[PDB]
A paper describes a structure:
β-Lactam-containing compounds remain the most important antibiotics in clinical use, but their effectiveness is threatened by increasing resistance. β-Lactam resistance is most importantly mediated by serine- and zinc-dependent metallo-β-lactamases (SBLs and MBLs, respectively), which catalyze β-lactam hydrolysis. B1 MBLs (e.g., imipenemase [IMP], Verona integron-encoded MBL [VIM], and New Delhi MBL [NDM] types) are the most clinically relevant MBLs; these MBLs catalyze hydrolysis of almost all β-lactams, including the latest generations of cephalosporins and carbapenems. Crystal structures reveal that MBLs have a characteristic αβ/βα sandwich fold, that they possess conserved zinc ion binding sites, and that loops flanking the active site are involved in ligand binding. We report systematic studies on the inhibition of four clinically relevant MBLs (IMP-1, VIM-2, SPM-1, and NDM-1) and the model MBL BcII by the four captopril stereoisomers and both enantiomers of a captopril derivative, 1-(2-mercaptobenzoyl)pyrrolidine-2-carboxylic acid (d- and l-MBP).
We determined high-resolution crystal structures for d- and l-captopril in complex with IMP-1 (1.71- and 2.01-Å resolutions, respectively), VIM-2 (1.40- and 1.20-Å resolutions, respectively), and BcII (1.18- and 1.10-Å resolutions, respectively). For the VIM-2–d-captopril complex structure, the ligands were modeled and refined with 100% occupancy, and for the VIM-2–l-captopril complex structure, 80% occupancy was used. The thiol acts as a metal binding ligand that displaces the proposed “hydrolytic” water molecule (or hydroxide) that bridges the two active site metal ions. In all of our MBL-captopril structures, the distance from the Zn(II) atoms to the bridging thiolate sulfur atom is ∼2.3 Å. In contrast, in the BcII–l-captopril and VIM-2–l-captopril structures, the captopril carboxylate is oriented away from the conserved positively charged Lys/Arg residue (Lys224/Arg228). In all MBL–l-captopril structures (including those with IMP-1), the carboxylate is positioned to interact with the conserved asparagine (Asn233) from the L10 loop. In the structures of BcII and VIM-2 complexed with d-captopril and VIM-2 complexed with l-captopril, the captopril amide carbonyl oxygen is positioned to interact with the conserved asparagine (Asn233) from the L10 loop. The inter-zinc distances increased to 3.8 Å and 3.7 Å upon d- or l-captopril binding to BcII and VIM-2, respectively, with the binding thiolate. In all cases, the L3 and L10 loops were observed to move slightly toward the inhibitors relative to their positions in the absence of inhibitor, consistent with an induced-fit mechanism during substrate binding. This is most clearly observed in the case of VIM-2.
Author numbering: 32 to 262
The structure:
Amino acid sequence: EYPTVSEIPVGEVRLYQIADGVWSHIATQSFDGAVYPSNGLIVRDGDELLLIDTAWGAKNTAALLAEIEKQIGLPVTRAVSTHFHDDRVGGVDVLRAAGVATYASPSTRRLAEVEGNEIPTHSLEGLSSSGDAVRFGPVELFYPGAAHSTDNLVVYVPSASVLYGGCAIYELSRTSAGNVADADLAEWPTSIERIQQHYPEAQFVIPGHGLPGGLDLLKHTTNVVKAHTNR
Ligand SMILES: C[C@H](CS)C(=O)N1CCC[C@H]1C(=O)O
Ligand code: NA
Ligand SMILES: [Zn+2]
Ligand SMILES: [Zn+2]
Ligand SMILES: [Zn+2]
């Protein structure tokens, strides 16, 4: 029942309740003539919401805010971007204009600036070394090491046993490597192993693109990465 890329027109956003107080958000964009989905997360924080990642662009992110207001009706007070690419920070200016406090690691902020992307306002401390974790409202943020990008973070919701892998974790249906231009292929498997080690109790694992599953998505990603490595 997870919404698929064929059931969301570009410009629209769907929410999917994963567990009590936890949703993913799903949006789409076209790339090179194909249509791709992208996921983020929404976590209830008392009477407010924590947003993880934009909906991939300004128009989608405006739609996200409208959909959250319509369906949930609680204010989004903070947002965290999990890496510097446009499916994570594209829409930050929209969030900021709407009064949402935007956050990312200093590593993400630097890379976004170099790329000419939107730059979250606030810097997250305590995430500079592989294996570092910090609590952020109702979630834990974890830097597993370089993988899909050098800055990628994962997010865990301990109340719900939900692990949001972002773009460091691939869905099962992805059989070959995606965008690896900014990746550290050599470190990626090691970084995945850190995630497995730190969150062995995860019940739901959400990739940055595509269908959720369980912890098997980690080994799946390792397999695809290692196949690409040996191309
Ligand atoms: C914008 C995302 C960031 S992980 C991306 O790179 N995509 C998403 C669609 C394909 C691929 C690309 O642009 O090469
Ligand atoms: Na932890
Ligand atoms: Zn990316
Ligand atoms: Zn602020
Ligand atoms: Zn992505």
